Paper text:
The Mex67–Mtr2 complex (NXF1–NXT1 in metazoans and small bristles in Drosophila melanogastor) is the principal mRNA-export factor in Sacccharomyces cerevisiae. Mex67/NXF1 is a modular protein constructed from four domains: an RNA-recognition motif (RRM) domain, a leucine-rich repeat (LRR) domain, a nuclear transport factor 2-like (NTF2L) domain and an ubiquitin-associated (UBA) domain. Mtr2 is a ∼15–20 kDa protein that also has an NTF2-like fold and forms a tight heterodimeric complex with the Mex67 NTF2L domain.
In the complex, ctMtr2 was not altered when compared with the isolated structure, with a Cα r.m.s.d. of 0.38 Å over 148 residues. The UBA domains and Mtr2/NXT1 showed a high level of structural conservation (Cα r.m.s.d. < 0.8 Å), whereas the NTF2L domain showed the greatest variation (Cα r.m.s.d. = 1.9 Å).
Numbering used by the authors: 2 to 164, 170 to 183
The structure:
Amino acid sequence: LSRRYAAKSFVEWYYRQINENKPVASGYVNNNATYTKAGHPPADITINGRVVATPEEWDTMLKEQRAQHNTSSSSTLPIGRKPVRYDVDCFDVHVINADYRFAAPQRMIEQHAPTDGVRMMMALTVSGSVYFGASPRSTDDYVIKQHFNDVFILVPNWDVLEKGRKYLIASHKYRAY
């Protein structure tokens, strides 16, 4: 399915960035000029029930999470452990609007019909686990394990689709426990 491919590609990118200690801010509408000129509001971001103003702050919170679980200065804890690792279990995607038109160049509207599976606004739900202090590939030797849920609203990246990320985050709700 076209929506599964799009979602799969985003999911793989997004959590790879986090696991490689790289910023995800470039995946949000905030940092796309085409959307910005068209007057799109900043991404709605909620982290464990708290509103976060910018994706850059979310990136900072992820750094802080690593620091919080960085026990490398310990002389007794087992060596070769990674502070934080995100594992995706599965995801679900639902097309909210198959004829999404915000900031769309007119050619893109004409070129892609609502049935072509390109101009989609998608609701993406991701389920997985967060491992703290675990070996790089272990799901058993963690010090702490969380379950997390991510809910994204994705919109088409016109810049890329007419030629980076083919879809951008317009909304993000994160919950981990």
